[PDB]
Design an enzyme around this catalytic site. Structure first.
Site, PDB file in Angstrom:
ATOM      1  NE  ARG A 103      -4.087   0.395   1.880  1.00 22.72           N
ATOM      2  CZ  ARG A 103      -5.253   0.567   2.547  1.00 22.72           C
ATOM      3  NH1 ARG A 103      -5.386   1.226   3.486  1.00 22.72           N
ATOM      4  NH2 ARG A 103      -5.992  -0.181   1.924  1.00 22.72           N
ATOM      5  CG  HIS A 130      -8.385   0.058  -3.101  1.00 21.28           C
ATOM      6  ND1 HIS A 130      -7.605  -1.015  -2.762  1.00 21.28           N
ATOM      7  CD2 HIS A 130      -8.817   0.604  -1.919  1.00 21.28           C
ATOM      8  CE1 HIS A 130      -7.770  -1.357  -1.603  1.00 21.28           C
ATOM      9  NE2 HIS A 130      -8.631  -0.411  -1.024  1.00 21.28           N
ATOM     10  CD  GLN A 133     -12.686  -1.587  -1.481  1.00 22.22           C
ATOM     11  OE1 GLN A 133     -12.123  -1.300  -0.509  1.00 22.22           O
ATOM     12  NE2 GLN A 133     -14.067  -2.435  -1.210  1.00 22.22           N
ATOM     13  CG  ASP A 227     -14.384   6.370  -0.416  1.00 23.86           C
ATOM     14  OD1 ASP A 227     -14.037   6.171   0.822  1.00 23.86           O
ATOM     15  OD2 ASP A 227     -13.186   6.523  -1.094  1.00 23.86           O
ATOM     16  CB  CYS A 269     -14.318   1.293   0.213  1.00 20.35           C
ATOM     17  SG  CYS A 269     -14.127   2.944   0.314  1.00 20.35           S
ATOM     18  NE  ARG A 297     -10.605  -4.903  -0.138  1.00 22.23           N
ATOM     19  CZ  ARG A 297      -9.676  -4.043   0.370  1.00 22.23           C
ATOM     20  NH1 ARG A 297     -10.004  -3.250   1.322  1.00 22.23           N
ATOM     21  NH2 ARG A 297      -8.552  -4.387  -0.039  1.00 22.23           N
TER      22      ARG A 297
HETATM   23  N1  LIG Z   1     -10.443   6.865  -0.456  1.00 26.39           N
HETATM   24  C1  LIG Z   1     -10.257   6.038   0.847  1.00 26.39           C
HETATM   25  C2  LIG Z   1     -10.254   4.664   0.381  1.00 26.39           C
HETATM   26  C3  LIG Z   1     -10.343   3.640   1.854  1.00 26.39           C
HETATM   27  C4  LIG Z   1     -10.396   2.065   1.276  1.00 26.39           C
HETATM   28  N2  LIG Z   1     -10.477   1.507   2.503  1.00 26.39           N
HETATM   29  C5  LIG Z   1      -9.703   0.240   2.747  1.00 26.39           C
HETATM   30  O1  LIG Z   1      -9.105  -0.275   1.584  1.00 26.39           O
HETATM   31  C6  LIG Z   1     -10.031  -0.523   3.926  1.00 26.39           C
HETATM   32  P1  LIG Z   1      -8.267  -0.057   5.085  1.00 26.39           P
HETATM   33  O2  LIG Z   1      -7.965   1.147   4.666  1.00 26.39           O
HETATM   34  O3  LIG Z   1      -8.857  -0.557   6.297  1.00 26.39           O
HETATM   35  O4  LIG Z   1      -7.519  -1.495   4.385  1.00 26.39           O
HETATM   36  C7  LIG Z   1      -8.868   6.564   1.302  1.00 26.39           C
HETATM   37  O5  LIG Z   1      -8.054   7.166   0.442  1.00 26.39           O
HETATM   38  O6  LIG Z   1      -8.712   6.407   2.522  1.00 26.39           O
END
Ligand SMILES: N[C@@H](CCCNC(=O)CP(=O)(O)O)C(=O)O
Ligand SMILES: N[C@@H](CCCNC(=O)CP(=O)(O)O)C(=O)O
Ligand SMILES: N[C@@H](CCCNC(=O)CP(=O)(O)O)C(=O)O
Ligand SMILES: NC(=O)CC[C@H](N)C(=O)O
Ligand SMILES: NC(=O)CC[C@H](N)C(=O)O
Ligand SMILES: CC[C@H](C)[C@H](N)C(=O)O
Ligand code: NI
Lengths: 336, 332, 336
Positions: A103, A130, A133, A227, A269, A297
């Site tokens: 990540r 992503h 996702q 989101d 998400c 996921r």
């Molecule tokens: N637009 C949001 C996307 C987060 C997606 N969430 C996930 O993948 C779950 P996690 O962060 O707990 O792994 C951002 O930029 O934060």
């Protein structure tokens, strides 16, 4: 020789269908208590430049369920900023683990890692897209198809900011031949480069896309997705600023769900900011599927790991004669 | 009773040969897709007082490949009394490693723990690096030369890796040189230990600032110039001491010999101790060397745990009884 | 449906005896080299809001020994922007069982209430129930010659820490005689004592909270803990010496006053020269390192008990399992 999973742009509709089918079959096995040991003794390096709950736990759990192990490399352990550092790190890690995910803060880092590593590399989210996702959301839509509709007959509306998840949803829905809408305000819509990529997908798939600030665009939606509004991890928009831009027009409330349709499902998400992009009533209501989505996921990550490692082994097969000889020589050495 | 791996000073040439042979046989098994489950259900505590990529990932991967698990205890998670910590951890894991700021900490941990303890690098030495480097030299022997016929030259600062390379090469009967500047050479105590090794092995050692000492080298090895983790030398200061005389460039490699191989423990500072041309060139083996950190760690873990089990054998009658009693309890 | 392990207040004497017996039988198997694979392919989420050595390593080792895996989550996952309900629902889909060490007790109560998988309290500001079970296992293994558990006297010396209260809870639950010897202003409070009284009305045990130095006399187990208080708000060295030293220092004089056969216990880590002297903690009657080992002993028994309970309430359908296994195998043999 390897394959990577950095963007769904390098995958066909047929390949994505295969990934969904593989993921769902593994899911059904595990749901009924059979854990297929498809990654026995394999090691995954997990590079996180930012915080994560869902993605991180999914990768670590997936490896255990499939007979391997995930190693968590926390923020600040691995620098991905500069090409020179990335080349050296890629070459070291390629000798020490079997597969890699990351990540990253900036998309070029994951592109470079995948380019330099000689083992498979998975994008666990960047500022651009992503893709894990995407696969999880596709699995979820397949499991929750409206009565008597095919996937390509469905309408998916993303509400709010043009996040990496918004773009990714556009990419996968248009790849699969569906109808996609980004309902968002001027200055926060998917940009010209985004839309050209969606257009290219539709020219192959027969799907459609629309980017608009017209509130009526939610009507007829089978899935309504949102989101957070605060933007990127490193540079968040303040509460006052983001309310000014998005509230109340882009809040997914019961009124908006009813306008979409009585059977429209709600997706997010996660994590969600309750009282901003979505109300408690919607996210906890009967038509919310965002916790099934969160489970998926893990579903999709298991399928991806198996697919990529099966691909790697097919391209780099073990010689069973030399394997037998090596096993015998080790046993003789340890006995004598 | 246990055995530790704190320094190769407590290991003979024959024991180091055994570790190399074990490590390379495990490597060939895994390379061809057989993972020997020699550490099934065993737990390794991994104490890191400083950062690490290669050593840390090697230990964690090694445990998975051999059927066990490594627990990463990050900097600040375990304070290192040492007696109390050693006694607690000895009841909770099967084997321990630690990367420590000061060598006395790893000596104390090994003394107090009742389970095997492995040194993952201190300010004094780096013995897992030694075994990995030895494996690498064995795999890359010059055509028609025996190990003990080889010349190994370390260039630059008298790092713990420099000293460790001196220890293992002299232990194996090879010819070792530290080419380094005045005030940065292996010290009198270091050299006395190398001399003692050579009196047994028939090898040799030399510490010098003479640029011609690289000539005839079969392996040319270097390391960073910025010194210890807790007290690094600045860029300006280290360039003043080492640059350009101690930079391993193509001219130096050619002076060593056309077939001389280049080694570096990594991470490297390109443009300082080594040039891009050398580290990425045809005679660089430093990425094979990095792979052999995992190779050697697998062999060490198996050796130490086999030793532990031999000294503390399981009673198979009591094992059978305990298994039956548990099964009856869970059934009834 | 699940069961949690947040407090021993929801467990009967008979249930605690079962946990001890299970823990000790697993211990004897592993001691002799048989590792029962009772948690095969299961994943434990380990949430730590504060530092830990013994508890953290015990959970991670226990999972490996029993065929599963423990995931260490540092202050990676926050209990903040996202509600406890949302985090609980997400984690419940991604791991099989959860533990958390928390700053405030309400956090572990809320996690347990919202999660649909078993939740274990790895210590809060209120109690420390895994310590309780480990200490009980230890007392059972070190019973005085010819005494039953319920005939024993256990004296805790010093501060009214969560470990002090927990020791009170388990000893009174098992029908033993408990004393907190501590100074005014640092004793177990009225609410604590009411809970101990309730336990004693059921068990026939007893409790006393006092600053009388003679209360140590006749103790079979003498237990202490650090003086610096809570992780987030420690008492300084000067302040805590003023409160506790020398009266509450467990030295050889105090052990002799308790009795020649009295065993010394401490949850660890210990501050030598404060609550206890080197002479006592390293002496022949110290059992605190056996006690430390029994943190792992008890954690293995708890994990097995809770997961066996979960599986009994949520059984696998073996017909659907067989079907899912076959479909996966056919897919992997025939498709690409
Ligand atoms: N637009 C949001 C996307 C987060 C997606 N969430 C996930 O993948 C779950 P996690 O962060 O707990 O792994 C951002 O930029 O934060
Ligand atoms: N003299 C150097 C030695 C580094 C050795 N490198 C390794 O062991 C690889 P790692 O640090 O990634 O584990 C120093 O003191 O920094
Ligand atoms: N009163 C003490 C209790 C510590 C208990 N110790 C343990 O559980 C061992 P660990 O912290 O190494 O896991 C405190 O509040 O600090
Ligand atoms: C090699 C030799 N069998 C030893 O042990
Ligand atoms: C003991 C018992 N078989 C249980 O339940
Ligand atoms: C990948 C998929 N099996 C096609 O072909
Ligand atoms: Ni792990």
């Amino acid at each position: 020789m390897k394959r990577d999973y950095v963007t769904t742009e390098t995958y066909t509709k047929e390949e994505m269908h295969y990934l969904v089918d593989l993921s769902l079959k593994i899911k059904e096995a595990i749901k009924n208590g059979y854990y297929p040991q498809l990654l026995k003794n394999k090691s995954l390096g997990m590079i996180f430049q930012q915080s994560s709950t869902g993605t991180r736990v999914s990768f670590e759990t997936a490896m255990e369920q499939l007979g391997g192990h995930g190693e968590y490399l926390a923020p600040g352990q691995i620098q991905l900023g500069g090409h020179e550092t990335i080349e050296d790190t890629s070459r070291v890690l390629s000798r020490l683990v079997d597969i890699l995910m990351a990540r990253v803060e900036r998309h070029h880092s994951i592109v470079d890692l995948a380019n330099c590593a000689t083992i498979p590399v998975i994008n666990g989210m960047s500022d651009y897209n992503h893709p894990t996702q995407e696969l999880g959301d596709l699995c979820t839509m397949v499991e929750h198809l409206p009565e008597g509709k095919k996937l390509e007959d469905c309408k998916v509306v993303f509400v709010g900011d043009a996040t990496q998840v918004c773009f990714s949803l556009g990419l996968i829905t248009t790849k699969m031949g569906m109808n996609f809408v980004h309902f968002g305000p001027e200055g926060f819509q998917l940009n010209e480069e985004h839309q050209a990529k969606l257009a290219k997908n539709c020219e192959v798939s027969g799907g459609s896309f629309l980017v608009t600030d017209d509130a009526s665009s939610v009507e007829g939606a089978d899935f309504l997705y949102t989101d957070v509004w605060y933007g990127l991890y490193e540079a968040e928009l303040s509460e006052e600023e983001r309310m000014k831009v998005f509230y109340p027009k882009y809040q997914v409330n019961q009124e908006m769900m009813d306008r979409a349709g009585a059977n429209c499902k709600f997706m997010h998400c996660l994590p969600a900011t309750r009282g901003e992009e979505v109300t408690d009533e919607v996210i906890d209501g009967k038509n919310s599927i965002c916790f099934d989505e969160a489970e998926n996921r893990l579903t999709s990550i298991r399928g991806l790991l198996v697919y990529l490692m099966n691909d790697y082994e097919a391209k780099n097969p073990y010689d069973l004669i030399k394997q037998a000889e090596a096993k015998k020589e080790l046993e003789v050495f340890l006995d004598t």
